[PDB]
Amino acid sequence: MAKWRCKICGYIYDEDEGDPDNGISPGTKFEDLPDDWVCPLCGAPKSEFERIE
């Protein structure tokens, strides 16, 4: 699946790994993250992410 990178801090959301610490299980698409999900490292919104893969 895709990788999305936070432009502010470089954190990569990997759809194959999800974000289990915030209740997002492996295999969840970036589009299916909650509208108000933020970068776990810097707090930037989804609008600051771009697909890198």
Indicate whether 1 belongs to the interface with Fe ion (CB under 5 A): no
Q: Which two tokens stand for residue 21?
A: 């610490």
Binds Fe ion by CB under 5 A, chosen from 8, 30, 37, 38: 8
Q: How far is CA 23 from CA 12, 28, 33, 44, in A?
A: 17, 11, 10, 18
Minimal distance, residue 40 CB to Fe ion, in Å? 8
Task: Please answer whether residues 24 and 11 qualify as being in contact, where contact means their C-beta atoms are separated by less than 8 angstroms.
Answer: no
Binding mask 21-50 for Fe ion (x = CB under 5 A): ------------------x-xx-x------
- Known binding residues for Fe cation are 6, 9, 39, 42
